[PDB]
């Protein structure tokens, strides 16, 4: 069968500015080439078919190029709105395949977290175990550093993480970080607090709580 | 006008048998061939199967030779896929796709289902804990949330006030606890003011465990 390879695979460039997608063929698939994009939780959507033509609707700043083995897809100026992942696939011989994807996301200008500390409560302290949640809202560049502190004591190993997909009309992200302890260990402690570090911020912040 | 609405996901035992449907319409769908695609979580897409218009002529991939049969009831409008002896490897979403060319040479694929995930384990259904995300006891802007807690499988929905919450609202990606349940948090942030004018409720909805939950967040 024949193997789509795409390059790059992650590309992040700001608004306004060019992207080029390309996608080689391991071998001849003439102009048999589609583009697709998918968002997060979505189906792909048919951006260009047979190489070098846009699918009904699609805007014009998406165009197609190539043959043979080499093709490009182009976005001629990014909007936020086109965060996504965008695929090639091949329809000149069974079985039709994709490629793996290029990744591109939006870059936009630095944003600090809005930190927010919530404790647990006591709908779930009736039940042994305690989640402390800590949110980051609404910030880029993607790359945060949050430690948990309880007492002052650093905590290690008893936290998870969650980052949003980049927000579709601003660009930045949100990240969820929860603690887990058992309610005795929660119970046996008084001061909980969640220490961000972020390119938006001149210093780390920390948001904190008093059990009680 | 053209829409692919697709049925039949969820949990299923390795080792076991699923079937999955696509009602179509906007279009003639005897017309089109029609093709089912998956894509495994985190992963990319694979072309699963195809199926001409009328139609008498089928195409699967290697990997699902023998035991995946894809099949149409052009009376009804509709497509299946009815998939036995399951692995965790089929574990994906799996969408509906119509061919934007018509007779059945290869396709490129002009419309899509919206996908629906099966999940192929052995683990039991469990429905979810929901708690209130609320502080201490702050700014002009205040961040509400629940905590979706301990649930399998994927995945759960939240909305806020029924729907007619969404500026704001931030759900986030579920994560495999160690106990192998899945936990979220949603969260809004709102103004401080409509916290003592508005009510806030958030709505889960896990359908594999037919649980639906409504949890008023209030300032504790």
């Known amino acids: 069968e024949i193997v789509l390879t795409q390059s790059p695979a992650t590309l992040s460039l700001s608004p306004g500015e060019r992207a080029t997608l390309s996608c080689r063929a391991s071998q001849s698939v003439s102009s048999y080439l589609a583009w697709y994009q998918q968002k997060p939780g979505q189906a792909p959507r048919l951006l260009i078919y047979?190489?070098?033509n846009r699918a009904t609707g699609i805007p014009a700043r998406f165009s197609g190029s190539g043959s043979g083995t080499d093709f490009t897809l182009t976005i001629s100026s990014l909007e936020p709105e086109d965060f996504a992942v965008y695929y090639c696939?091949?329809?000149?011989?069974?079985?039709?395949?994709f490629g793996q994807g290029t990744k591109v996301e939006i870059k936009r200008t630095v944003a600090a977290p809005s930190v927010f500390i919530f404790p647990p409560s006591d709908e779930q302290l009736k039940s042994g175990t305690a989640s402390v949640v800590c949110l980051l809202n609404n910030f880029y560049p993607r790359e945060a550093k949050v430690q948990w502190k309880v007492d002052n004591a650093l905590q290690s190993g008893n936290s998870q993480e969650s980052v949003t997909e980049q927000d579709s009309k601003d660009s930045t992200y949100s990240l969820s970080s929860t603690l887990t302890l058992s309610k005795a260990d929660y119970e046996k402690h008084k001061v909980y607090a969640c220490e961000v570090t972020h390119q938006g911020l001149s210093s780390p912040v920390t948001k904190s709580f008093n059990r009680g | 006008e053209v829409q692919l609405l697709e049925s039949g996901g969820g949990l299923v035992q390795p080792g076991g048998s699923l079937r999955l449907s696509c009602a179509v319409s906007?279009?003639?769908?005897?017309?089109?061939?029609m093709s089912w695609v998956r894509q495994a979580p985190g992963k990319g897409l694979e072309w699963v199967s195809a199926?001409?218009?009328?139609?008498?002529?089928?195409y699967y991939a290697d990997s699902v030779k023998g035991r995946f049969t894809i099949s149409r009831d052009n009376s009804k409008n509709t497509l299946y896929l009815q998939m036995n002896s399951l692995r965790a490897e089929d574990t994906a979403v799996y969408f509906c796709?119509?061919?934007?060319?018509?007779?059945?040479?290869?396709?490129?694929?002009?419309?899509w289902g919206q996908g629906t995930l099966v999940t192929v384990s052995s683990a039991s259904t469990k429905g979810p804990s929901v708690f209130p995300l609320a502080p201490s006891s702050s700014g002009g802007t205040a961040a509400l949330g629940c905590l979706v807690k301990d649930y399998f499988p994927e995945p759960v929905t939240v909305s806020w006030n029924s729907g007619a919450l969404t500026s704001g609202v931030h759900t986030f990606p579920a994560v495999l606890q160690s106990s192998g349940l899945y936990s979220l948090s949603s969260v809004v942030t709102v103004p401080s003011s409509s916290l003592g004018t508005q009510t806030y409720i958030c709505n889960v909805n896990h359908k594999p465990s037919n649980t639906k939950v409504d949890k008023r967040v209030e300032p504790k």
């Open positions: 047979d190489a070098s």
């Open positions: 199926i001409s218009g009328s139609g008498g002529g089928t």
């Open positions: 796709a119509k061919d934007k060319i018509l007779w059945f040479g290869e396709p490129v694929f002009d419309y």
């Open positions: 906007g279009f003639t769908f005897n017309s089109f061939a």
């Open positions: 696939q091949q329809r000149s011989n069974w079985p039709p395949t």
